[PDB]
Subunit: 278 residues, 3 copies
Amino acid sequence: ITARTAPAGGEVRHLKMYAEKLADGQMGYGFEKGKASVPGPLIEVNEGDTLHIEFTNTMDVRASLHVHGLDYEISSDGTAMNKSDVEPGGTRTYTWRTHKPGRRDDGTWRPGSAGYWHYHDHVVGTEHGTGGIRNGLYGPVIVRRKGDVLPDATHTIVFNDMTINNRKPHTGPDFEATVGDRVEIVMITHGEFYHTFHMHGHRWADNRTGILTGPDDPSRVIDNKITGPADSFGFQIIAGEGVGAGAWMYHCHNQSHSDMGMVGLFLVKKPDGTIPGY
Amino acid sequence: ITARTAPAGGEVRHLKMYAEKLADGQMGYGFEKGKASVPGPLIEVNEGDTLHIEFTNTMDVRASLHVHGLDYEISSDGTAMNKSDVEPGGTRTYTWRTHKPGRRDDGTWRPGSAGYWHYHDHVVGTEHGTGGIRNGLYGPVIVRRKGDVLPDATHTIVFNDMTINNRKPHTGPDFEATVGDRVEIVMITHGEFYHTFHMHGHRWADNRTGILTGPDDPSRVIDNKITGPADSFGFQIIAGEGVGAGAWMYHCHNQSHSDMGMVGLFLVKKPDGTIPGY
Amino acid sequence: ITARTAPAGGEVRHLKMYAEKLADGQMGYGFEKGKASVPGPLIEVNEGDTLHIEFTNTMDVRASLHVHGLDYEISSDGTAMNKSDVEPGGTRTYTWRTHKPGRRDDGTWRPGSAGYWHYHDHVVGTEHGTGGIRNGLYGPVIVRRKGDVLPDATHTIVFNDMTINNRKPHTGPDFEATVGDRVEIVMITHGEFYHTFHMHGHRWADNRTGILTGPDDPSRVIDNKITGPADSFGFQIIAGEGVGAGAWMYHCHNQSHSDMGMVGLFLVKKPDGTIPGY
Ligand SMILES: [Cu+2]
Ligand SMILES: [Cu+2]
Ligand SMILES: [Cu+2]
Ligand SMILES: [Cu+2]
Ligand SMILES: [Cu+2]
Ligand SMILES: [Cu+2]
Ligand SMILES: [Cu+2]
Ligand SMILES: [Cu+2]
Ligand SMILES: [Cu+2]
Ligand SMILES: [Cu+2]
Ligand SMILES: [Cu+2]
Ligand SMILES: [Cu+2]
Ligand SMILES: [O-]
Ligand SMILES: [O-]
Ligand SMILES: [O-]
């Protein structure tokens, strides 16, 4: 493999993160005060890293940080129950650990942390973060296993209730690549609805990484993936591979939902920068 | 493997296809004028084939042909956007290509086109084909990989909203096999609801082919599969294997939906043609 | 592998089961009169066993026993249609067989019975057991393959409409383990809704067993699984592995559904019996 690939992990990474009410009513995470996004920033680590997140709640309401998939002690699951949210103005230090796979003493095989995970609020609105997740307190987390191929870029599509990334219907987001780019999608669903994520012209493998190890990988290859609240998958595609450049739609294939605007564009450009048609 | 298996692909195939309003209000595809069906005809090819479809719209409205999974350029994705539908009376030539798997130059592994796919309209009713798909403009596409086991017969069950194959509730379809037949099911969902497809007395592997490579295939074996709009999967079973002949129901296991009528019969006969019970 | 593992099967097992109206209006299955439970008792067998269930309906209404996944002749599919339910006061003898995987004469590979399955009523309320299932006529079935790891304990969570195990919202069930226990979960959905089962602090493999065979298993590793009516999966976890003890929430991650009360606790204790927090 002469493509770039992930290194063995085991570093202790530190991070500042803020919850911030946005002028428009929404709430978002950010790494800097006043640079909050919906989705929140992508956090990426290698199997075996440890992440110390110094989380500061700049909001007038309790708020928390709860993560999927990664190892965390109960002090860091970010629930009101476990005395683990953060009161307004407060600052708490969450710790996410990750681990590689390997045999346990009993001879069984321990799964690693690798995957396409995500984080979100667990206290705003309700004791399950329905308000926070609605207002935009979610973001993607990627844990790489030593060897995973690394992309040219990662984009995060989040189906949150009837929106993509908390955007007005029929407003994307759109994305751009050039034919041949290795594009990584992190696809997260939040809210109370079920969806099917469809991408024109492209397909991935329905497994951990969206990529086939080689000729023996039995994983189904799909281009429509059903998805429900707190589901998260990811994949990599070669932009326009086998199909050329174009304005390739992605959308929820639920007919009412795409009709109601859950649609974006994967704009794959010719090397001259043009998109055929469009 | 003394069963029949798919040959290596690489042919160029031509096809005439028609969209047509049916006397009863629906719309269907067909290979011949006046011989249209809902679901539309099955297109089946081998990885590496190329398919040229001379599509002719015999309807008074714009209509298109959009396919999943297969390689196609943006001129053949059948969206209004990409100037790719077909106006009434018009005739466009869509091209779908397919490719085998193999190593890329970066050493990664490119997935092949093989799968259980489908094609449907993308412009009738809405810019997402909500009307076409509701009326019947959908059909199955099978792409086989060299060596795939070939069935004795394929059948197509489509859960389109609260119907099976656009049939009035509580009216099938029913299918027939003799015990021991290798039956292939192609299972497509369309519309705005989510379903679970259940078959009595039979089970398959939740992977690309519904069939386990052999002793090492980790794929889960299931008899109930959740399924959302534009989801498509397929499998093969041995009719009555281990259970003998009978009127074996298949249905959406959603309790309200099977109540409202999404039920059919897999009628597996003894050699004498009789169904125990029934 | 120095953990306990399932033996090769092939025994002929016998069983008495009862359907029982419960004082509070529900219906339950049991192994003894007056000892019925919702969910019903867990039947567990090895690939190759045969199970003869002497089912006795003690209710004023027709009721049946229909099983997923296992081999059964149409005489024992428990549908009104195939004259296979049981009249009030009646006693039928259902038979479920299971088989191991192996090569067929055509050289294809026949799947084994192994899996996380379930049984439920098929005639109470409607011709599809909608009333039976609503009232609690469902229970889990585990078919083990020779070699499967055996757990320290199994627990069954059933999402039946807006309830867990037919319990009043916000009332568990809760379970307890001690850090390090090998806990098996059998997860079944019933009714008319779709769900996502999430579990704090833990993760399993989305395959047949929830466990990775070793370093080549491509199976996604998840902590949130979408689940529809009559869907059934299972897994094992090491209680608090990598995360220590705590009141570990599990719930439907559907924001409205967990809000409405589909929540339980996985109470993982230290040897003290103490739960940090709680
Ligand atoms: Cu939670
Ligand atoms: Cu949707
Ligand atoms: Cu498409
Ligand atoms: Cu969550
Ligand atoms: Cu589309
Ligand atoms: Cu349904
Ligand atoms: Cu069944
Ligand atoms: Cu489509
Ligand atoms: Cu049934
Ligand atoms: Cu739910
Ligand atoms: Cu969680
Ligand atoms: Cu069932
Ligand atoms: O589509
Ligand atoms: O069933
Ligand atoms: O959560």
